[PDB]
UniProtKB/Swiss-Prot annotation, chains A, B:
Gene: KCNH5
Tissues showing expression: Detected in brain, skeletal muscle, heart, placenta, lung and liver, and at low levels in kidney.
Cytoplasmic side: 1-207, 255-281, 313-318
Binding, a nucleoside 3',5'-cyclic phosphate: 518-635
Protein name as it appears in the record: Voltage-gated delayed rectifier potassium channel KCNH5
Ranges facing Extracellular side: 229-233, 340-387, 409-414
Function: Pore-forming (alpha) subunit of a voltage-gated delayed rectifier potassium channel that mediates outward-rectifying potassium currents which, on depolarization, reaches a steady-state level and do not inactivate. The kinetic is characterized by a slow activation time course and a small voltage dependence of the activation time constants, therefore, starts to open at more negative voltages. The activation kinetics depend on the prepulse potential and external divalent cation concentration. The time course of activation is biphasic with a fast and a slowly activating current component.
Residues of the full protein shown: 11 to 692 of 988
Phenotype upon changing K309A: Left-shifts the half-activation membrane potential
Main location: membrane
């Protein structure tokens, strides 16, 4: 919902007369005399500063030939004019107009709320008032006493060695208007400049997960290529690397054409702000990562890219667990690469020509079976075996299992082992604490329900409650949790605003408003004033709703279940669905008591509205009380005692009368 | 804020007359006739015991030549006098004065609140009242009927074989006054005696972290030097050891000149208390640690020093994690030193001359490659390899990984291993439980926000709320958490005092007081009486604030957003920023209803003040109500219906009138 005349005009616009009009009986809204009419050009609000689309009441002079129907007619023409009518101004002069015209129709197809951006002048023609005629008071001071459209572009004398150039905001401003103004009626939603995409569309979503997948691929492939020195025979990987690099470069380019949330939580949409913000925030790192061994470790920063985007991901529970297991695998892989690099460095001393029998590649070669042979040193474990052994060792070390068939024995490997031990201990602790908490986050609610059940059971056992009452209490608790699964309405309604709470309650009833032929002629005033008062109740079988222990003070509505109005051990009516039972409240102003013993056959759901909160609303909306009185029929009028009389035992009464 | 005359005079001062005065119209404050004028020397409060800087009203005698303007003039002289005026005393005699004078001016430069420490006498000259003239009643009993400055130093007869020595509190007490009295006006803050430093300055902070760093250094270096027997060739370490020792000794000396918080939570500042407290509390341990193998284990007590200072550190989250990892490293290092000591003890039996093939140094030597050789037993693993192996083993044992390439096999090592196992299990459990809790302490708040979101989402899903209402509720919750991130104002305002709460609220408004030209002529009374009543509201787009469902009873102020006052499907005014809309309350004393349908264009923030809590304050401060009435202009007076009339359809009404 937007009338498209205020939201984004306080930044770029200038002096204008954004006439709206409403077009039923006489004048309504001219509204925006914005950007310069503060307290120095016209009236203030409640005047033609804010209404009377065709302006008046600021006249202050006589009705001359030009001062009647020239632009006063133009205001409701909407199309085009160039004449000169009078509208009073601070200059104390017979004001006439130089202006520009611009139409636009509607979205609702009503020929209302046009654009009509106007300028108005007083100076450029003539002052001829004799209020001050002391030489240069109105014949040369005219260039001083105007505070109008002149003060937008050309705030100097109208001559100023210039004839038509200074006519750009009074005579030739129509080229700066039209499509440069917001529309006359549209729909309010986050809108973007041309060739700009929002950050929550179906395009940026797919690219976010695509970039995440490619980053997860690079974080795996780059350390492997750096440590386990590979080859280039397969040109397939050589071209997929270029494909991924160019995809990331295209994403860097496309990041200029997106939207980001700023201070306060609103979608910012303007090319210059987007560009400079993205630049200053991430362009250095993005360029460094996009474009010899150290170059790949620099290239790894696309993982920090996903780290910055992490706020978009997560918060969904299962995704957190998947991310945690993925990062555990990633750190295991990185430690495997470092471990293999160390193991390859240690074997084969280059000072002499000998193989160091300590390392871990020599022990692995001895255990597997394939040894190192000299012919300069070639022949040993295959690359797949080396990688799988490195991963297996680092997984033994991270998971704190520890086997010992692959263990550090040299000097460098022990230092690296203690470093890995500290790092892995920290990561293990944090990661699996988070995993356990995430897994317990829902069994927390389940255990809340179980704790409620256990507390009720313990209370029933401790005080030695009989079997029937205990089983009824258990059944009621089970049913109430079944239809109210953990969710509590009071808090959710408390954290919402007043109007939104009223709307939520109105939709919560949904079966006593559009189902009962009484609440029909109420659009949005009575429905949102009564629903805040209706309260839903659930009643167990055998419960006495309005037995002879309470007075009738609530117009109860039945929406699900069945009730029988027991009167002296027997039933006079059996209420079903959509049958209101209760006392008349709006036309007696009295009180009575329970004329019956209303029970509940099955589990029932009723909608109580209190008496004092019922007739007040219909008294406020007097047009609704008439329909309410004329369209409500009480199925069981629990106000008057009925003449209740039972079939087949006055027979023996008459028999005894004839006998006695 | 301190007038410097009560805070610290009840411990050292004596009889005095600490005259203040206030100097505008007539008398005000002489105030402190402290330390002896309880109920036995003069009047009580509300008299020249507390006001009338120039004293009077305690006369009780006739106006003699000396009894008019001698010291009664001295009180406002402030400079010097030695004369004798009358001021009535319990002696029932024509009192005259022996006194001492002392001036001091101000801090605010006003020549007010001088020092004027006076003494007053009655005895030393003469009693000549004939009330009791029964011999030794006023000529010899004079030495009994005085209860004044005599009762401070020389409480005996004025003769007492002494002439001028007994004149030390009536004639020669000026040398015990002056700079020995607190000032006349200063600023209140924790102050220290000369050559005393506070415990939260920028000096003791740097020394606290310096001592912490040096203690962390010693706790690492001392066990290493004790176990791995080092040398002295590098004189560099030999001089850094002396430098650190002398630094710690200087710190022990400097601890005499610091301040410590005592009982109740106040900064104690007095050399004797500081000295004796520090001595009795820590001097034994500090001296023992400051100043052959056992001497270093004693020297290790500087770690207990940091343990005592620990309260200063910690409580910052990240510092807790850093401290925990540091102590884990420290215990690993200590266990490494003990393990190497055991391993060095076991190898090479001294009864025979043989090497024990069990230990762990022999197995390590066999695995590494360098064996033990005999020529008495020399040659083996280097010192760096020995230390790194010891650390690696103890880190395998503490982190509960366990590899087995270095494992206990002798008799002593198994007992030490089980002891280390129990100790490491305890330390592991406590340390990493604390680490996990500290890490979860902030994701607790994040998970509270996520739980609120999940509860709202579940409530919306369960009851099948339509799309528009659900999305509006989600947006409102997101915005409210965005600008109110976890922080709840009610609790923080509850735990604060009343005046501080009022000040916090006054600063919380900050945009309806110093921005609106109405709340200008109110210094501190009306602002702190109205801000406790103002409540801020946030309204979502499309919300109806004061539609035709409520009566106008609140002078709402707009500080951010925009509102349009819809009247019969169309708008008569569009409120902006700093535009108050509401009913007049202080000059009609009536009630009306919503003459409009005020909506909210964008997200808005308003400042409601209730009617009954508004005019009461301005009624209390009658000088403020005049300015409030004369300086408030309602932008949208939602009290009176305006004559609203719409432009361009009476045209067809007149057309039909001419047609029908
Ligand atoms: K093992
Ligand atoms: K283990
Ligand atoms: K083993």
């Amino acid at each position: 919902p937007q009338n498209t005349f205020l939201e984004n005009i306080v930044r770029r616009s200038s002096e204008s007369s954004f006439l709206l009009g409403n077009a039923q009986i006489v004048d309504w809204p001219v509204v925006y005399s914005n950007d310069g009419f503060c307290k120095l050009s016209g009236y203030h609000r409640a005047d033609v500063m804010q209404k009377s689309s065709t302006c008046s009441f600021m006249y202050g002079e006589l009705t001359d030939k030009k001062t009647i129907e020239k632009v006063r007619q133009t205001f409701d023409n909407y199309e085009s004019n160039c004449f000169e009518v009078l509208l009073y101004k601070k200059n104390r002069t017979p004001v006439w107009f130089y202006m520009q015209i611009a139409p636009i129709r509607n979205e609702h197809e009503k020929v209302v709320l046009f654009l009509c951006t106007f300028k108005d002048i007083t100076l450029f023609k003539q002052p001829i008032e004799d209020d001050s005629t002391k030489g240069w008071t109105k014949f040369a001071r005219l260039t001083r006493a105007l505070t109008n459209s002149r003060s937008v572009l050309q705030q100097l004398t109208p001559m100023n060695k210039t004839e038509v150039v200074h006519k750009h905001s009074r005579l030739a401003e129509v080229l700066q208007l039209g499509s440069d103004i917001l529309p006359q009626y549209k729909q309010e939603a986050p809108k973007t400049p041309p060739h700009i995409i929002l950050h929550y569309c179906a395009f940026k979503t797919t690219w976010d997960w695509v970039i995440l997948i490619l980053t997860f691929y690079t974080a795996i492939m780059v350390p492997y290529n750096v440590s386990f020195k590979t080859k280039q025979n397969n040109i397939a990987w050589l071209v997929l690397d270029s494909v991924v690099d160019v995809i990331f470069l295209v994403d860097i380019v496309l990041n200029f054409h997106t939207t980001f949330v700023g201070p306060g939580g609103e979608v910012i949409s303007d090319p210059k702000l987007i560009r400079m913000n993205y630049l200053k925030t991430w362009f250095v790192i993005d360029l460094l990562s996009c474009l010899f061994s150290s170059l790949k470790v620099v290239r790894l920063l696309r993982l920090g890219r996903v780290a910055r985007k992490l706020d978009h991901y997560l918060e969904y529970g299962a995704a957190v667990l998947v991310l945690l297991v993925c990062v555990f695998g990633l750190v295991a892989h990185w430690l495997a690469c470092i471990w293999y690099s160390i193991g390859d460095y240690e074997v084969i001393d280059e000072v002499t020509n000998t193989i160091q029998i300590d390392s871990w590649l020599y022990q692995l070669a001895l255990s597997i079976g394939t040894p190192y042979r000299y012919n300069i040193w070639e022949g040993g474990p295959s690359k797949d075996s080396l990688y799988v052994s490195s991963l297996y060792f680092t997984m033994t070390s991270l998971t704190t299992i520890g086997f010992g068939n692959i263990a550090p024995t040299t000097d460098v490997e022990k230092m690296f082992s203690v470093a890995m031990m500290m790092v892995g201990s920290l990561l293990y602790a944090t990661i699996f604490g988070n995993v356990t908490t995430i897994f317990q986050q829902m069994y927390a609610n389940t255990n809340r329900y179980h704790e409620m059940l256990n507390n009720v059971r313990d209370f029933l056992k401790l005080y030695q409650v009989p079997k029937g009452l205990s089983e009824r209490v258990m059944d009621y608790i089970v049913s109430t949790w079944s239809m109210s699964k953990g969710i509590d309405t009071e808090k959710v309604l408390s954290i919402c605003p007043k109007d939104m709470r009223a709307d939520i309650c109105v939709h919560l009833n949904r079966k006593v408003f559009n189902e009962h032929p009484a609440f029909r002629l109420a659009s949005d005033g009575c429905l949102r004033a009564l629903a805040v008062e209706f309260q839903t109740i659930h009643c167990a079988p055998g419960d006495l709703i309005y037995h002879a222990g309470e007075s009738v003070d609530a117009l109860c509505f039945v929406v699900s279940g069945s009730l029988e109005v027991i009167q002296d051990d027997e039933v006079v009516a059996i209420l079903g669905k959509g049958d209101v039972f209760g006392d008349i409240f709006w036309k007696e102003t009295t009180l009575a008591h329970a004329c019956a013993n209303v029970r509940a056959l099955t589990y029932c759901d009723l909608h109580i509205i209190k008496r004092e909160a019922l007739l007040k609303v219909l008294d406020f909306y007097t047009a609704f009380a008439n329909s309410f009185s004329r369209n409500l029929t009480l199925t069981c009028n629990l106000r008057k005692r009925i003449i209740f009389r039972k079939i087949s035992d006055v027979k023996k009464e008459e028999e005894e009368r004839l006998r006695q």
